[PDB]
Design a protein around this ligand. Structure first.
Ligand SMILES: [Mg+2]
Ligand SMILES: [Mg+2]
Ligand SMILES: [Zn+2]
Lengths: 90, 111, 102, 41, 71, 102
RNA sequence: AAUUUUUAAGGUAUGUAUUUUUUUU
RNA sequence: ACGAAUCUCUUUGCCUUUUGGCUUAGAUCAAGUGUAGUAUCUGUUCUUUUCAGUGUAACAACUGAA
């Protein structure tokens, strides 16, 4: 249940996604052993997409966050879409 | 199917823009209805499954058999199927381990 | 009337190929991606400007830095080296070593 | 001057959200948060 | 890349004949040969008691469709 | 600032060649008809073999120069930009067009 | 209170060369 | 100084296949394991005070106090 991604299999995605684009995931797993398409896509969206925001937290965010999490009880995709951040970070 | 999914997305965007249709008044009255009923019936809220619970293994057996009956028939298996059947067979080989895995997910995992 | 199905086959030879054959194909393409398509030349080939110019391939298949005299297993390792602090130094040393003569 | 077409769905041969929420959600959750605290007292 | 389709004149300059080779089709057999010329306790108890858009997909007829056949 | 329509450009080149020609004339100074047949209306014009050979040589020479200068822009063009990843020449060339689009 | 009968095609490729009496220096 | 020719250089400008089409993304499919062992990249720490022992081919390294 590991499915853990080494820095080589992270470096091959970003080169595969650059080549094949984001809707050909079946081809990305051809370049990448150990990993299926649903595993490749899920990482590209949750981690490796450079348009993702992994950064420190301003003082307005923790106010914005604790506002949403209170006003929307557990819904962490809907909050994350409001925050423009990946859910498991938010 | 492409049309249907488009109507779903349109509907949900419009519920973001307009907002919920309940109004807080109706929601309050509904909540009152429930609470009064559950008092009238003196209901005991369902607990969280304890560490040692009498039936854990049995509730597994029922669950895992419900999952396995799908692949009892199937002939040529795709990859996802083999993945699942691997998970079920492991669930029989370590019941305790997979119970701990389950309960842990009942706590921590919100995405 | 089995045309109802919709699968078929071409009439040539025997299809799937052998798992070993897939790895050879997959490990060439992965070394094409990470390499960004460059042709890294063999050491004996008697020099198409190289992206860098130091990396080569010995009479065996391995990759080598000709400055640092290091041997590398894969492109991924090389990019570690080219981004390393030793391959930094040997450029500076050759930097000085040229700046003292012409 | 036209751009160059790059498709997400094909790479043949060579050639390598804004708006916020509503006051609807803000108001509804309070009523459920208030009405619950009242009922839990 | 269809680009330039096919010109008729090259097919119209072929030396077959004025007609085709003389194949007799089944739809060129003479038909319509002539022309035509013009000239109270129960009620109380409860808690809650008492434009055409131009588009195919956002239209009103469409939602009715996916309201039924997608069940 | 700016582009130029194919008219003005044509004029400019006309002037350029006028100047070049006038210089050939001056340096040549430093180093130192119409008949139409009665049978057919075909007109004939007397020609100096010189200046015609000079013309052909001018055209060929200018073509050589243009071809060469463009060729040098070929050479520098590929050797200058090594920043982003590229699989082949054509890729790099296209992405330099993307640099022109900015 | 009475039906109704069968032949082709989409599957085993396709392409090239091959039996020749020695065109005048 | 100037009319002015030719080679060299920068810039502006000009620019190359700047992906052959179409449909239900046209459809679907993918990684063996265990025991022993070596090779090879990168990151982090040290060229820095004396003497006494251990240690080494000699270093190094390790061990004490001013
Ligand atoms: Mg077929
Ligand atoms: Mg057909
Ligand atoms: Zn090096």
């Amino acid at each position: 249940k590991g499915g853990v991604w080494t820095n080589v299999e992270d470096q091959i995605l970003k080169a595969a996604v650059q080549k094949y684009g984001t809707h050909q995931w079946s081809k990305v797993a051809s370049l990448l052993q150990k990993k299926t398409a649903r595993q490749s896509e899920l990482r590209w969206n949750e981690y490796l997409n450079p348009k993702l925001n992994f950064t420190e937290f301003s003082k307005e965010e923790d106010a914005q966050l604790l506002d949403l999490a209170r006003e929307l009880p557990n819904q962490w995709r809907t909050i994350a879409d409001m925050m423009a951040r990946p859910a498991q970070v938010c | 199917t492409r049309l249907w999914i488009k109507n779903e997305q349109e509907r949900q965007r419009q519920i973001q823009k307009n907002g919920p249709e309940i109004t807080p008044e109706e929601a309050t009255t509904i909540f009152s209805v429930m609470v009064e009923w559950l008092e009238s019936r003196s209901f005991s809220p369902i607990p969280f499954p304890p560490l040692t619970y009498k039936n854990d293994t049995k509730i597994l057996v029922l669950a895992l058999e419900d999952l396995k009956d799908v692949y009892a028939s199937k002939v040529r298996l795709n990859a996802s199927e083999r993945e699942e059947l691997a998970l079920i067979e492991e669930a029989y080989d370590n019941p305790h381990d997979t119970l701990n895995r389950i309960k842990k997910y009942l706590l921590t995992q919100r995405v | 009337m089995n045309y109802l199905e919709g699968v078929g086959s071409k009439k040539g030879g025997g299809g799937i190929a052998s798992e070993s054959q897939f790895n050879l194909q997959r490990r060439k393409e992965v070394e094409s991606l990470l390499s960004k398509g460059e042709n890294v030349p063999y050491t004996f080939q008697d020099e198409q400007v190289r992206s860098n110019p130091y990396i080569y391939k010995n009479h065996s298949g391995k990759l080598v830095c000709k400055l640092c005299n290091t041997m590398h297993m894969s492109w991924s390792s090389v990019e570690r080296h080219l981004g390393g602090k030793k391959h930094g130094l040997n450029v500076l040393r050759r930097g000085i070593s040229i700046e003292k003569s012409s | 001057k036209i751009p160059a077409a790059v498709s997400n769905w094909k790479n043949p041969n060579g050639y390598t959200e804004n708006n916020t929420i509503n006051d609807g959600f803000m108001k509804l959750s309070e009523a459920l948060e208030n009405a619950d605290k009242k009922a839990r007292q | 890349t269809s680009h330039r389709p096919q010109l008729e004149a090259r097919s119209g300059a072929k030396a077959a004949a004025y007609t085709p080779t003389g194949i007799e089709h089944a739809r060129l057999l003479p038909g319509h040969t002539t022309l035509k010329y013009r000239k109270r306790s129960w009620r109380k108890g409860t808690a809650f008691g008492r434009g055409y858009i131009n588009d195919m997909t956002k239209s009103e007829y469409h939602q009715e469709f996916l309201h039924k056949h997608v069940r | 600032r700016g582009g130029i329509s194919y008219d003005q450009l044509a004029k400019l080149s006309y002037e350029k060649t006028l100047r070049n020609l006038a210089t050939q004339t001056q340096n040549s100074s430093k180093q130192d008809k119409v008949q139409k047949d009665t049978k057919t209306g075909k007109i004939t014009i007397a020609d100096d073999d010189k200046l015609v050979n000079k013309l052909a040589v001018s055209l060929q020479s200018e073509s050589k120069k243009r071809y060469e200068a463009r060729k040098r822009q070929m050479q520098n063009a590929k050797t200058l930009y090594g920043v982003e990843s590229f699989i082949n020449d054509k890729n790099k060339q296209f992405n330099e067009k993307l640099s022109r689009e900015s």
